[PDB]
Design a protein around this ligand. Structure first.
Ligand SMILES: *[C@@H]1O[C@H](CO)[C@@H](O[C@@H]2O[C@H](CO)[C@@H](O)[C@H](O)[C@H]2NC(C)=O)[C@H](O)[C@H]1NC(C)=O
Ligand SMILES: *[C@@H]1O[C@H](CO)[C@@H](O[C@@H]2O[C@H](CO)[C@@H](O)[C@H](O)[C@H]2NC(C)=O)[C@H](O)[C@H]1NC(C)=O
Ligand SMILES: *[C@@H]1O[C@H](CO)[C@@H](O)[C@H](O)[C@H]1NC(C)=O
Ligand SMILES: *[C@@H]1O[C@H](CO)[C@@H](O)[C@H](O)[C@H]1NC(C)=O
Ligand SMILES: *[C@@H]1O[C@H](CO)[C@@H](O)[C@H](O)[C@H]1NC(C)=O
Ligand SMILES: *[C@@H]1O[C@H](CO)[C@@H](O)[C@H](O)[C@H]1NC(C)=O
Lengths: 49, 99, 88, 50
C-alpha cells in the first residue's frame, strides 16, 4: 500500500541499467510426401485402384 | 453428465480476477504510470491529470483553472455508462457468442 | 540487440529503472507579486524550508527563476497555491 | 475399435493443448503486476468519484 496524500510526491535519486531477453519462433521444418509410395509402394494394382 | 463429455473448471476463480483488477485500479489511481516501469511513486491526482494534459499539447494552467468543471464532466460521463450498458440489449453480443 | 538461434531469434533489451526514491512536499503553483507561476518542465519541490524545481525522473534541485517558469494567470483561482519569492 | 489405430491419442492431445492455452490466455492478460496495491481509506481525489 502506497501512502497517498494530496501534497506529497516521491522522486527517484538513482537509476539502474537492466538487460532482459526474449525468444520468438520464426520458421519450422519443410516436408514433402509422395502419395503412391506411402499408400501403395510398388504395386501397380493399388495405384490403378 | 453426458456420454463421455466433461467440462473442466478454470484455474483462476472470479475473485482472483477481481483482485487483479482492483490492484490495477488502485495502482493507476495512487501512482500514475510509474508503477508499470519500476517502484510505485506517489503523486496527487490533479498533478497527474496536469501531466496527462501536458502530454497531448495543452498547458497545465488550462487544467488548474478548470478543475471543478472537468471533475463534474468526468462524474457525469462515468455515471451515464451504467445506463448506456443496461439500455442496449445487444451490448455484450461478443461475450455471448462464445457460450 | 538481436541474436540468431535455431528456428528463431533472440532479442536483448536494454532499459532504464529508477531507484532510491525520496518523499517530498509539492505545490501546483507559486504566487509572487499577485501572479501565479507554473514550471516550464518540472515540478516544485520543498525540502522543508526552501523551494526548488527539479526534473521528474531524477532529483536535481534548481533555484526558482523567471527563466524556467511562466506567469499565465492570477493568484485567486488555483487551489493549493503556495506563495514564495521568484528571483530574477 | 482397437484395429483402427491411434486417433484417440491425437484427439486427447489436441483437447489438452486447447485447455492449457485457455488457461495461459487469462494468465497472460490479467497477471500484469506482481504487487497487490490498496486504496487509501479516505476516498478524496480532488473532486473525482471512482
Ligand atoms: C547509485 O547506485 C550505484 C550502484 O549501487 C552506487 O554505486 C555504488 O556505490 C557504493 C558505495 O560507495 C560502492 O560500494 C559500489 O561499488 C558502487 N557501485 C558501482 C557499480 O560503482 C551509487 O553510489 C549510487 N548513487 C548515490 C548517489 O548513492
Ligand atoms: C459519487 O456519486 C454517487 C452517485 O451519485 C454519490 O452517491 C449518492 O449520494 C446521494 C447523496 O447522499 C444519495 O442520495 C445517492 O443515493 C448516492 N448514490 C448512490 C448510488 O448510492 C456520491 O456522493 C458521489 N461522490 C461524492 C464524493 O459525493
Ligand atoms: C487533502 O487536502 C486537504 C486540504 O484542505 C486536507 O485537509 C486533507 O487531509 C487532504 N487529504 C488527505 C487524505 O490528507
Ligand atoms: C515518505 O513518508 C511517508 C510518510 O511516512 C512514508 O509512507 C513513505 O514511505 C516515505 N517515503 C520514503 C521513500 O521513505
Ligand atoms: C533545505 O535547503 C536549503 C537551501 O540551501 C538548506 O539551507 C537547508 O538546510 C535544507 N534543509 C534540509 C533539512 O536539508
Ligand atoms: C501568502 O500566503 C499566506 C498563506 O495562505 C496568506 O495568508 C497570505 O495572505 C499570502 N500573501 C498575500 C500577500 O496574500
Amino acid at each position: 500500500s502506497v501512502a497517498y496524500s494530496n501534497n506529497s510526491i516521491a522522486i527517484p535519486t538513482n537509476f539502474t541499467i537492466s538487460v532482459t531477453t526474449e525468444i520468438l519462433p520464426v520458421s519450422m521444418t519443410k516436408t514433402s510426401v509422395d502419395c503412391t509410395m506411402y499408400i501403395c509402394g510398388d504395386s501397380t494394382e493399388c495405384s490403378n485402384l | 453428465k453426458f456420454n463421455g463429455l466433461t467440462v473442466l473448471p478454470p484455474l483462476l476463480t472470479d475473485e482472483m480476477i477481481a483482485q487483479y483488477t482492483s490492484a490495477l485500479l488502485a495502482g493507476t489511481i495512487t501512482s500514475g504510470w510509474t508503477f508499470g516501469a519500476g517502484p510505485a511513486l506517489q503523486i496527487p491526482f490533479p498533478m497527474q491529470m496536469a501531466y496527462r494534459f501536458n502530454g497531448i499539447g495543452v498547458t497545465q494552467n488550462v487544467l488548474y483553472e478548470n478543475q471543478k468543471l472537468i471533475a463534474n464532466q468526468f462524474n457525469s460521463a462515468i455515471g451515464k455508462i451504467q445506463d448506456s450498458l443496461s439500455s442496449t440489449p445487444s451490448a455484450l453480443g461478443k461475450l455471448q457468442d462464445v457460450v | 540487440f538481436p541474436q540468431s538461434a535455431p528456428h528463431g531469434v533472440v532479442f536483448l533489451h536494454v532499459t532504464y529503472v529508477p531507484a532510491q526514491e525520496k518523499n517530498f512536499t509539492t505545490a501546483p503553483a507559486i504566487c509572487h507579486d499577485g501572479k501565479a507561476h507554473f514550471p516550464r518542465e518540472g515540478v516544485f519541490v520543498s525540502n522543508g524550508t526552501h523551494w526548488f524545481v527539479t526534473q521528474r525522473n531524477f532529483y536535481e534541485p534548481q533555484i526558482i527563476t523567471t527563466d524556467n517558469t511562466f506567469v499565465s494567470g492570477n493568484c485567486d483561482v488555483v487551489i493549493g497555491i503556495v506563495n514564495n519569492t521568484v528571483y530574477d | 475399435l482397437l484395429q483402427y489405430g491411434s486417433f484417440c491419442t491425437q484427439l486427447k492431445r489436441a483437447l489438452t493443448g486447447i485447455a492449457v492455452e485457455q488457461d495461459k490466455n487469462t494468465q497472460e492478460v490479467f497477471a500484469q503486476v506482481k504487487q497487490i496495491y490498496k486504496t487509501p481509506p479516505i476516498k478524496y481525489f480532488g473532486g473525482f468519484n471512482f
